[PDB]
Symmetry: D4
Subunit: 137 residues, 8 copies
């Protein structure tokens, strides 16, 4: 149903919520320590290298409607993965962007949603502030 690649503060944090709301989630990450840390939250916590076109097939990643690339300080895999996923014809692929340049490649690459955790949170914050006063509550 929902696959999340890269378990950092952003990616992991989304695996939990997905769990808390009673949803099955496949969480993956080359680093095994990161995998064990969420084994209790994901319907399945696998260890793999998302960039490896084969391991991706090991996870039947092509059977998920949504995959979330949460790779962080690695514009390399973040981009390679998104590309690979784009081949498996994965319906919706959402990716975290590390910087501006990244956002651009991601757009053209074919990502369905780009997330800028920092900025995006900003908009949501201004939005929250706005509600507090407009709706008045």
């Amino acid at each position: 149903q929902f696959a999340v690649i890269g378990l950092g503060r952003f990616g992991g944090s989304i695996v939990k919520e997905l769990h808390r709301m009673g949803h099955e989630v496949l969480a993956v990450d080359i680093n095994e320590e990161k995998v064990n840390a969420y084994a209790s939250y994901a319907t399945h916590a696998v260890i793999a290298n998302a960039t490896e076109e084969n391991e991706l097939l090991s996870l039947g990643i092509r059977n998920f409607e949504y995959v979330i690339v949460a790779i962080g300080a690695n514009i390399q895999a973040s981009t390679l993965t998104t590309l690979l996923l784009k081949e498996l014809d994965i319906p919706n692929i959402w990716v975290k962007a590390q910087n501006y340049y990244h956002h651009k490649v991601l757009e053209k690459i074919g990502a369905d949603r780009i997330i800028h955790p920092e900025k995006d949170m900003g908009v949501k914050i201004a939005q929250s502030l706005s509600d507090e006063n407009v709706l008045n509550y």
Copy 2:
């Protein structure tokens, strides 16, 4: 008038000044670095240059007249907390602060911050919510 004041114009803080603007709201944006100030002068009702930690400059901005102040200082937990701690002094109704890490979050909870934001984590839970709603 004088409802939102944003201190620290980084990717997070600045990004909220624009949105505040785009939604037709007046915003006071501040930041010691003048280059950062000029960069948002077009978005804020007022873009001032100042050192938030300086108890006097803070008074120069009538910061006590704002219902909401947002401390978006980043890689300088030092100022971030002093500011917040100063803001607390002026009895500023609502003060929201970005937390740099776990400790920072812990202090802010005891310092007296009204809302702590973890852009990274908090947005994560945000996306979980969206995938959930999409299906």
Copy 3:
């Protein structure tokens, strides 16, 4: 009676004198090597993370009239600890300040005495020099 958190040149050095003058002292420090180094001087040398609200309770730290935060190059714990201690309603809390900014947070935080080992020693030195000539000895 007297609790000292952080056994560096400053903090430790005070544990000894407290000892030498026949006083019971509780010396604590996450780093165990630092703890063993003063085990012979303190009435009790515990290993703990002062920032951990629970471990602090493990030491009955709330039963001391004086606690000394001697944390050094860690404006983080130095500040968190002082805060935690300020909650346990610890009567007198003396803290070493790392820099100016630190001194300010400490003041507002609620510390009862801030120590600037470098500067403070200066005043004591000028004072000593002064005595040598004024009292004339």
Copy 4:
């Protein structure tokens, strides 16, 4: 007159120049770095710029006419000891020096320093003493 001379205006050395001043005492403060010199010109009876290690500049300041000289050089054990060693030459009655570490302390004891100060440790024993007196 000409009783205290302080070489090296860092947090330690400078801090003692002010106190000397506050207590109404004349002080000669010196330091190669001119920015440090201007910073205390208001506190010292005389704020000179010089290289303490230079056996001649030392003579430019009549440093031999002071009963007390305080070497507050910090992260430069090199100068700190040469200075002290030069001061010893001029037969300066009392020379107190800040020690950077254990070795420095050891040399100073053999160099001929009259008093070695370990701001960190020495203040520690100072605080032990105060807690003791408070109870």
Copy 5:
């Protein structure tokens, strides 16, 4: 006319601009760094200064009118790929790109690059071939 365009004038890219010149061919050489541009102005039919990643500057050079574009960006896989990805947009017939490492090579294969060059390896196989022919 308008047959070869080389983006990025480093040891690899520049070295190909000269040869193109030496063999009596017109070449458009480009590079954000102006010092690099002046260095080959003597070799290229046109040495422009620009940011290849900027979708507009690319249009300033009529880059879409070239049969061959060579991305010789080096230690900046970031631009190297964005450029290539932009070039792909303009439907540039043949785009050859230098690969910085294994990943870069992999993306370029999926990005749509027509030829990936690994100066180090590729030249190795080149020398193997020469020893072979010498004997």
Copy 6:
């Protein structure tokens, strides 16, 4: 027949092709991990320090018509080796040059061919581009 010293992207890559074309090759390199990595491609993959005048003799390096110094970020051994080889009266010695200065010493030293993987590839690239249009294919 063909000896290759230094198995980096350049040097190794040439050992393979030499293999693929059915040629016997002696590949050497101090680092054993690099040696094992090509043991399957070379008629012989030895571990040695090319700069050691003795080890060089251990490999009968004087019995090869061609030796290729592919040492990379080590202008030291690259140069020492070429010198040593130049003593063994090795017929043809081809060396990879790290920078310009290196190229100059190599020329004067007595190297028979200097390779600038980066630049040389450039010329071959311009050449290829040229063929595509002149020969028209």
Copy 7:
């Protein structure tokens, strides 16, 4: 007869020559690997910390007419040692100077000869050049 403290290129190199000319030498150095490396050249190769006033006594260092402080990139021990030795009333103490400042402390400290391996070698070189032509040989 001759004691040498610090076995670096300079210090060690002098232990050998002392040996080669049939002289007994005591070579010392905290680092044991350096000590083993000259055990075959010195009448005695001890491991110790020259700055330790006690270990120095362990070597009866006060029984030598000449001690050579060859400590290098350690203006600390080089100076402390020379001081300690100066207390044991060691007749002649020769020290390698690391920089100018060092040379000055050494002079005042009381060293009998300061050596600037770099510069001193220079004078000897100019001297050699001079002989080649003046004496004409």
Copy 8:
């Protein structure tokens, strides 16, 4: 006249230019860095600024007219050896070079240097000799 030429004015090389001077000998001192050149202009019969590796500048100094050239280049084995290798070309009678390490020494032996100097070691054997003579 034209008997000694010293290339590279560092602690070693420069130190030999002075001594050559003090003993009343003419010396040509050279070094790319002009500040180093001015520093010894008072000691050398001629203090030129040049790049020893440049086969032409070397000719600008008539370096081929000197019986002895001393390469005192230090932390740049690159130039040190190229120079020496160039000097060899001009058939310079005697060329003495400072060796930076073991390798450098090995190449110089094969390059054709007439004398290799290891300031550190060589002086060590020098001191051994003096202690020996003192007793």
